[PDB]
């Protein structure tokens, strides 16, 4: 059909069809008379994975021969989504497979919808990991993702009576065709025990063993024939484990629990033992692998020339004391040399602002679980604090603040402090966030080692997030400027010369309208609800969090509702307001916000006076595959975090790329997005970071806003009085009480400027042509936010390797 | 190489080779430079399973079109062993694959040794199930095996310091290439709840749901293109299960524990809840499947014309009340009609003599776990006892003895009683055992319903147990009489006309000698121990059990040792005595016997005066694949159970087929074996059943034997005094004490006649030609003990179906 989806050669289609029927028969053991859509999807998945195999083997072979420096991306989360379409895009098979399946009487789009998301992440951090792998493979880097193969990913969200219920994400039930088990590369991991000191140094003994079994998933680069590896570890009990008989076998589950389930907290630290086990497990098994591969090229001076280990937040911070443990206790390097090697090898990305998201592990946990690592951490602290004392003599307070050990009723290790000390590079994930790291939470560290601190602004892969999810927009762009932009997104600037082309204006608005029609129909088919597709699609999708201020949005929505009721016969620009996102199961307030959203919907969507002028939709089970559908359909992107709380954001970027205007605070990458597009082409409102700091000094009194803003007071009274909860009048008292007395995120402070700015959005939408010209200005300046740019900067400025766009042979 | 292994056509070999390299690449994702023997085995396994696929699909298709009566073999155990060689034998691929692998530079025999046993059974009962499936497929019956896919089969046995240690049998670690998951045919199974009575009848409510997910394994018939199915169920938690969050997900393991582990007791009932859950789980899920298939051909009169359900002992006895529950409560048939259908559908094979092996479930367990089933069982009992009262009026004692409910401190359901009442046929597994069922434990039932009681003497499949394990013997037989005997084993009688052929005598003894050489070398390679292969191979392999009297054998062994020491310079026929078998983990006495065996070995095998004249070897980890090696290597088969305790035995048959003479009691199928071969051609010793009964009436006094037999007294004194345990003098006091005061199996009573009969064995072995002529007489009359004969009798006399030897099209 469309050009960026590749060729459908007659040989190619014929071959795909015969291999599809071979797999249906031999692999699935079905005949065509009993197959279901699910079988057809599996037959297709196996057919496509076949084209990965040669490329994967030759790639891994090439890395063994050339021996380049190897990048290890350690993360506890990889939010991969579906693999089938991405594989077809990256191998230029999409049209051929479409054609092949079409001649077998099947609709490929319908088979694609059968694939489960690999939901091994919570949101932004996990998804960044996934975009990174894609960009690492596309830029020909010898890169490996390492993590945990959780049996259960992020829970499936049901809404029952307007409340979130959680169900186990049994993503492996039907099998994962994209993974290859490698039980032959199974490795031991140790826990508990104790430390013996000898003449020949320290010895970690009487440990419990858990086995780590790797599953490899291929990561195809974009049309370069590169296929990198994502290796995920699974926990298995040793066979002499606990070894009356029956109970011993059943207790194997205690060890295997380590890889059972993803912790579902977004920007929240929960200090549980099982989580610490998860962190050590991926670190211990990964480092053994790294070292094994290094030794197949007794001398570790070259280690940092052959190995970069990137830590995705502090979650794998134990890689630092583990690398030391291996080098000092097993390889018998002296401390100072081992440490040099460790620092030159490791680099730490911070993804975190909020104090309650910083990992601070109680010492008694580390003492029991990882006794040698705690000895090593203490030794790191002492040597580190000795350098602080020498540089800042007499500054005893600095010593207290910089210590890796926090004093308290419970002593804790500050894993962030461990990462800065133990890494040659520390970066944040957007310019304003990297500035905040230097000015506030890591000021002291910055003053000691200024050279370590960098910025690497985040990005998203334009393969999944343009070509894949929005083929029609990719196409009209490729019509004017060619295909090359897909791996070089800066080329979208060339679209600025089409900003006054009537035909391009028509095509951009046409694609948007088709995306809306298609998403609206998706809502009817799968969830029986009727949206006006000529309305403005106002969408806020991201995890449910106080700092992301879904509640500010709710206040806007209720304001529009009250304005319509006061003046029912006045014209207003119609909106479909859609909010979606999961709340962490233990976050009471996030769960209340979801409930308020659905409660608002029940009032607004059933008011006859409102008509189709205002609709409020809670989008259930927000995940990667739903993002691929709703983001191309959106007109307005809501990026409305309180200034200084969103480290970067990446949703923001996905929307800019996909033809929606942004309403947002000067937070995270919003700042850079506005700077790229021009402030005139962005709906910026509200407090800056500096304003928030001024408000904090004089004290945030929410009451002042309630007293001065009648529209706002009206809303608080409706919430309190049970306008939105007739049967439980007091349902939302916790929301009111928090907004009035304990709002860390200053929702009321931004309320007035948000409502005003929302009016400017409405006014522009009234003028389709100028709306669309502004969209073009956004798409055309979104180049910077390619994860290819991000990864090239990581490669050049941290890892010391040169990216490449040159294809391996096919 | 040899003829019964099929053709190696040039097309066929070329094709096998290319498919082996395709699977190595595409399936295993390896290149030839990094593959290990294990990869090669997997590539071969996938290549061979490919030839099963067409046959499996067409077979299952044919059964849907022809709609024959369907046989359901329900068992908690299927002791399958390895699948690769059996598949090749049954598809006539063995020589082609040999040739294909040979030209790739690989040794197929070495790849075969990499396959794990599927050890989903304890011994005889499980293995009979496996032989049955093979014979059902070979005889073209529309037959299905149903059971549980245990994650852990029978434990691996290590000997440490002469003691059994158990390790978890992680048979699935590397994947099972022979199974196909069918998660799409997942079915619910209910537990707990309670019963509500309504107007519309009884309702089972508030249940816990466990899902049953089927895995299908193909069962190829012998060269007929039939491929039947073995369907094994796995337990999965529903996704709303237990649904803080983390703990709920971890507790899914409670439900999945149902299919986690095989209970490792041989002829012993252990009344645990988890075992009862296993029994209901396979029954509930299987019956849903049976019924679904029946309904795709509201009227159940035809059900018994379209369905036979065979119960492998009482383990799936709940099929009877479950079938009633479905017919009465869900299908709303009246009781009497449902019952008729149930009786005509079900048939019960008893495998059990020993009182401690009979299943008697406490009522309080059934009350909690399966409340409706208990109501139904009680209703069955009442109606059954009403028929007893009418037939035997006034015989109140008979009522007590025949009740399904046993009265006691704890009330119990006698599952055997439930099976007789609820089945149209009840059979034992050898003539003498079926006679004992009619004369003692089920006398009362026999007098009520004489027509229900049958004999079906056991058998073994000559494919695994001759062709596969002993190709050289198969070949010399095929040289004289052709190939047809492999599916018609009665044709071995034709070998009687070769009993005085010098060339045949030479070939039979040659094959035996080659098997011994090969087994001896296997002992050196894998277990570093040096056996004289010119010695007589005296072997007793079977589970460790007091009733099987390994201890009698030990007494013989110690007697030979003491005779050598008394008269060191006298000639004796050299022996290698090998005993192997697992003990149940909780069976203290079985574990002591193993220890005594190794203790005897430590004395005898290190005595310089003994030389290579006597060796005692404990064969570690006895299992199906070890049986395939040692049974062809044996000269003397030890079948020495106390008369009346071995229901049948099947080891006995495997040895007769493979060219060993039998020393045995008139127990089990030993009686029929002797009758077939002639008593002159068998080493029969010891008490008959009648003798044991006489001894029981007057009282078994072990002391009398100890006082009258000096040789025996000497042995008891050595055991007591620590001759065999120098560092722990009293180690074996529990063995002595049991033999002297509490021997249920009357070891001393058979001692004298056993030693005498062992002397006759030694004397015959001194005359190779006459030894071998006797072997020929044994092999030649072993036809009856084919499981093809057994299954044909089940088909004709119980299931009402006609077997067939006609091939499906290829
Ligand atoms: O989406 C994100 N999640 C986390 C984060 C931080 C700490 C955690 C601790 C425990 C568990 C999960 C955690 C997740 N940080 C985020 O990283 C994205 C990628 O840089 C940024 O775009 C987001 O602004 C930022 O919020
Ligand atoms: O389950 C399996 N997955 C793959 C496989 C093959 C190629 C791939 C290419 C790309 C990504 C994933 C891939 C996975 N091979 C399989 O290995 C199992 C263990 O060896 C076998 O039991 C399966 O029959 C076989 O199908
Ligand atoms: O090998 C056998 N195991 C059992 C058996 C009986 C009751 C059980 C109860 C619980 C668990 C396992 C059990 C096993 N019976 C046997 O069946 C074989 C097949 O008919 C016979 O040849 C054996 O003589 C007989 O001993
Ligand atoms: O793991 C698998 N086993 C088989 C399979 C195919 C043919 C067979 C023929 C006979 C016996 C067993 C058989 C098993 N197919 C597989 O199904 C998985 C689930 O659909 C896929 O993920 C695997 O990639 C694929 O290899
Ligand atoms: C990109 C993405 C996120 C991160 O979005 P933010 O708006 O930056 O919080 C979260 N979840 C999913 C499913 C995504 O695709
Ligand atoms: C045949 C067989 C048995 C049964 O042997 P008996 O001597 O009848 O107890 C037990 N275990 C294995 C491995 C077998 O192959």
Q: All domains of chain B, ordered by start, with CATH? A: 1-459+787-810 (3.40.50.2000), 460-786 (3.40.50.2000)
Residue B553 Cα to ligand 6 middle (Å)? 17
What CA–CA distance (Å, rounded) separates A744 from A751?
Answer: 15
Cβ neighbors of A110 (< 8 A, separation 6 or more) are A37
Residue B627 Cα to ligand 6 middle (Å)? 8
> DSSP character for A692?
H
**Tokens 């367990």, residue located:** B365
CA of A271 vs chain B CAs: smallest distance (Å): 13
Q: Is the dihedral of CA A376, A347, A292, A256 positive or negative?
A: positive
> DSSP character for B786?
B
- Ligand 4, residues B22, B180, B215, B228: which to mutate, most atoms within 8 A of Cβ? B180
Type and span of the H or E element at B566: helix B550-566
Interface of B with A in 140-169 (CB under 8 A): 152, 155-156, 165-169
Query: What b/e sequence results for B538-548 when a residue is b if at least 16 CB atoms lie within 10 Å of its CB, and e otherwise?
Result: bbbbbbbbbbb
Lookup: tokens for B26:
């595409």
* Residues A234, A259 contacting (CB under 8 angstroms): yes
- Nearest CB neighbour to A53, from listed B25, B174, B586: B25
What CA–CA distance (Å, rounded) separates B128 from B540?
Answer: 19
Write A697-700 long-range contacts (CB < 8 A, 24+).
A700/A743, A700/A746, A700/A749
Burial category of B524 from C-beta neighbours within 10 Å (exposed 0-12, middle 13-18, buried 19 and up):
exposed
The alpha carbon of B276 is separated from its chain's Cα centroid by a whole number of angstroms, namely 21
What CA–CA distance (Å, rounded) separates B187 from B169?
Answer: 27
Closest atom of ligand 2 to A217 CA is 11
Integer angstrom CA distances of residue B196 from B200, B283, B325 = 11, 23, 14
Do strands B143-148 and B70-74 pair parallel, antiparallel, or not at all (unpaired)?
A: parallel
Locate the DSSP E strands across A199-306. Answer: 201-220, 227-236
- B249/A57 touch (CB, cutoff 8 Å), yes or no: no
User: Of B387, B419, B185, which is closest to residue B318 (Cα–Cα)?
Assistant: B419
Integer angstrom CA distances of residue B257 from A256, B74, B75, B120, B655 = 13, 20, 19, 16, 38
* Residues B630, B541 contacting (CB under 8 angstroms): yes
Integer angstrom CA distances of residue B172 from A91, A211, B176, B218 = 34, 15, 6, 17
Closest atom of ligand 6 to B650 CA is 8
Please give the residue of chain A at the shortest CA–CA distance from B50: A26
Q: Does B632 touch chain A (CB under 8 A)?
A: no
What CA–CA distance (Å, rounded) separates B436 from B426?
Answer: 13
Type and span of the H or E element at B294: helix B273-294
Quickly count: other Cβ atoms within 10 Å of residue B684's Cβ: 18
- Ligand 2, residues B22, B25, B27, B175: which to mutate, most atoms within 8 A of Cβ? B27
* Mutation target vs A (from B173, B257, B268; most A CBs, 10 A cutoff): B173
**Helices assigned H by DSSP within A72-140:** 84-91, 94-103, 108-112, 124-138
Residues of A noted as catalytic: 351, 542-543, 548, 650, 654
Cα distance from N-terminal residue to C-terminal residue, chain B: 25
In sequence order, the β-bridge partners of residue B205 are: B194
Q: Does B50 touch chain A (CB under 8 A)?
A: yes
* Residues B163, B154 contacting (CB under 8 angstroms): no
Q: Does A69 touch chain B (CB under 8 A)?
A: no
Lookup: tokens for A315:
């979650």
What CA–CA distance (Å, rounded) separates B759 from B764?
Answer: 9
What CA–CA distance (Å, rounded) separates A396 from A444?
Answer: 12
Closest atom of ligand 3 to B349 CA is 20
What CA–CA distance (Å, rounded) separates A439 from A431?
Answer: 12
* Residues B126, B627 contacting (CB under 8 angstroms): no
Compute the residue count for chain B: 810
What CA–CA distance (Å, rounded) separates B650 from B787?
Answer: 10
What CA–CA distance (Å, rounded) separates B518 from B532?
Answer: 12
Locate the DSSP E strands across B610-745. Answer: 614-619, 636-639, 661-664, 683-684
What CA–CA distance (Å, rounded) separates A571 from A360?
Answer: 54
What CA–CA distance (Å, rounded) separates B508 from B519?
Answer: 17
* Residues B348, B309 contacting (CB under 8 angstroms): no
What CA–CA distance (Å, rounded) separates B618 from B158?
Answer: 11
Helix (H, G, I), strand (E, B) or coil at A263: coil
**Helices assigned H by DSSP within A541-587:** 550-566
User: Of B209, B251, B216, B254, which is closest to residue B232 (Cα–Cα)?
Assistant: B216
What CA–CA distance (Å, rounded) separates B385 from B378?
Answer: 10
Resolution in A: 2.4
* DSSP states of A456-494: ----B-TIIIIIIT-HHHHHHHHHHH-SGGGG-GGGGGG
Longest dimension (CA), chain B: 89
Cβ neighbors of B42 (< 8 A, separation 6 or more) are B23, B27, B28, B174, B175, B177
Find the residues whose C-beta lies inside 6 A of ligand 2. Answer: A 49, 52-53, 178-181, 218; B 27-29, 42, 175, 177
What CA–CA distance (Å, rounded) separates B708 from A682?
Answer: 110
What CA–CA distance (Å, rounded) separates B128 from B465?
Answer: 12
What CA–CA distance (Å, rounded) separates A442 from A42?
Answer: 50
Cα torsion B583, B584, B588, B593 to 10°: value is -10
Integer angstrom CA distances of residue B519 from A778, B472, B594, B622, B769 = 78, 14, 22, 14, 22
Q: Count of H helices and E strands in chain A?
A: 32, 23
* Mutation target vs B (from A235, A249, A250, A274; most B CBs, 10 A cutoff): A249
Integer angstrom CA distances of residue A195 from A202, A207, A428 = 7, 10, 36
* Crossing angle of the two packed helices B471-481 and B502-527, in degrees rounded to 10: 170
Cβ neighbors of B193 (< 8 A, separation 6 or more) are B204, B205, B206, B207, B208, B371
């Amino acid at each position: 059909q469309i050009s960026v989806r590749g060729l459908a050669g007659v040989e190619n289609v014929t071959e795909l069809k015969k291999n599809f029927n071979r797999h249906l028969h031999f692999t699935l053991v079905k005949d065509r008379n009993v197959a279901t859509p699910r079988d057809y999807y599996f037959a297709l998945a196996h057919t496509v994975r076949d084209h990965l195999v040669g490329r994967w083997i030759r790639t891994q072979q090439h890395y063994y021969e050339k021996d380049p420096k190897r990048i290890y991306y350690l993360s506890l989360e990889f939010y991969m989504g579906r693999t089938l379409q991405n594989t077809m895009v990256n191998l230029a098979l999409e049209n051929a497979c479409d054609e092949a399946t079409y001649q077998l009487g099947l609709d490929m789009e319908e088979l694609e919808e059968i694939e489960e998301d690999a939901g091994l992440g919570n949101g932004g951090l996990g998804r960044l990991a996934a975009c990174f792998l894609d960009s690492m493979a596309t830029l020909g880097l010898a890169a490996y993702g390492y993590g945990i193969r959780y049996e259960f990913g992020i829970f499936n969200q049901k809404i029952c009576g307007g409340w979130q219920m959680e169900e186990a994400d049994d993503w492996l039930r039907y099998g994962n065709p994209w993974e290859k088990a490698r039980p032959e590369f199974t490795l031991p991991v140790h826990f508990y025990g104790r430390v013996e000191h000898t003449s020949q140094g320290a010895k970690w003994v009487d440990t419990q063993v858990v086995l780590a079994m790797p599953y490899d998933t291929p990561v195809p680069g974009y049309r370069n024939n590169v296929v990198n590896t994502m290796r995920l570890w699974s926990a298995k009990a040793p066979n002499d484990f606990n070894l009356g008989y029956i109970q011993a076998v059943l207790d194997r589950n205690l060890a295997e629990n380590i890889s059972r389930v993803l912790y579902p907290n977004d920007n929240f630290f929960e200090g549980k033992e099982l989580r610490l086990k998860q962190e050590y497990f991926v670190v211990a098994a990964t480092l053994q692998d790294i070292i094994r591969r290094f030794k197949s090229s007794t001398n570790f001076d070259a280690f940092p020339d052959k190995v970069a280990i990137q830590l995705n937040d502090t979650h794998p911070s134990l890689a630092i004391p583990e690398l030391m443990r291996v080098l000092v206790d097993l390889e018998r390097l002296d401390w100072d040399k081992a440490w040099e090697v460790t620092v030159k090898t490791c680099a730490y990305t911070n993804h975190t602002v909020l104090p309650e998201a910083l990992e601070r592990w109680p010492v008694h946990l580390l003492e029991t679980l990882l006794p040698r690592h705690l000895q090593i951490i203490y030794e790191i602290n002492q040597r580190f604090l000795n350098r602080v004392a020498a540089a800042f003599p007499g500054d005893v307070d600095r010593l207290r603040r910089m210590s890796l050990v926090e004093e308290g009723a419970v002593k804790r290790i500050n894993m962030a402090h461990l990462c800065i000390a133990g890494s040659h590079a520390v970066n944040g994930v957007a310019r304003i966030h990297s500035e905040i790291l230097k000015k506030t939470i890591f000021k002291d560290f910055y003053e000691l080692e200024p050279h370590k601190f960098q910025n690497k602004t985040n990005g998203i892969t334009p393969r999944r997030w343009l070509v894949l999810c929005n083929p029609g927009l990719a196409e009209i762009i490729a019509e004017r400027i060619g295909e090359e932009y897909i791996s070089d997104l800066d080329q979208l600037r060339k679209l600025l010369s089409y900003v006054d082309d009537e035909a391009f204006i028509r095509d951009v608005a046409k694609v948007k309208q088709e995306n809306k029609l298609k998403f609206a129909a998706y809502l009817e088919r799968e969830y029986k609800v009727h949206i006006n597709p000529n309305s403005l699609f106002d969408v806020q999708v991201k995890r449910i969090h106080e700092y992301k201020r879904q509640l500010l949005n709710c206040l806007h929505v209720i304001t529009l509702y009250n304005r319509i009721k006061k003046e029912p016969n006045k014209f207003v620009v119609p909106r479909t307001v859609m909010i979606g996102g999961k709340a962490a199961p233990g976050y009471h307030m996030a769960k209340m916000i979801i409930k308020l959203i659905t409660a608002i919907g029940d009032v607004v969507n059933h008011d006859p006076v409102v008509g189709d002028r205002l609709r409020v939709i809670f989008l259930e089970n927000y995940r990667v595959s739903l993002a691929e559908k709703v983001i191309p359909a959106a007109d307005l992107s809501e990026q409305i975090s309180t200034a200084g709380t969103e480290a970067s954001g990446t949703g923001n970027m996905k929307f800019m790329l996909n033809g929606a205007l942004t309403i947002g605070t000067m937070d995270g990458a919003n700042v850079e997005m506005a700077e790229e597009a021009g402030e005139e082409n962005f709906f910026i409102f509200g407090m800056r970071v500096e304003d928030v700091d001024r408000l904090d000094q004089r004290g945030y009194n929410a009451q002042e806003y309630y007293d001065r803003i009648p529209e706002l007071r009206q809303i608080i009274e409706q919430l309190s009085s049970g306008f939105f909860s007739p049967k439980q009048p007091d349902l939302f008292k916790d929301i009111v009480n928090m907004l009035m007395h304990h709002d860390r995120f200053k929702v009321f402070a931004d309320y007035e400027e948000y409502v005003k700015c929302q009016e400017r959005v409405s006014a522009l939408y009234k003028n389709p042509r100028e709306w669309t010209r502004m969209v073009i200005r956004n798409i055309a300046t979104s180049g910077k936010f390619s994860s290819d740019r991000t990864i090239a900067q990581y490669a050049r400025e941290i890892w010391g390797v040169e990216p490449s766009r040159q294809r391996l042979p096919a």
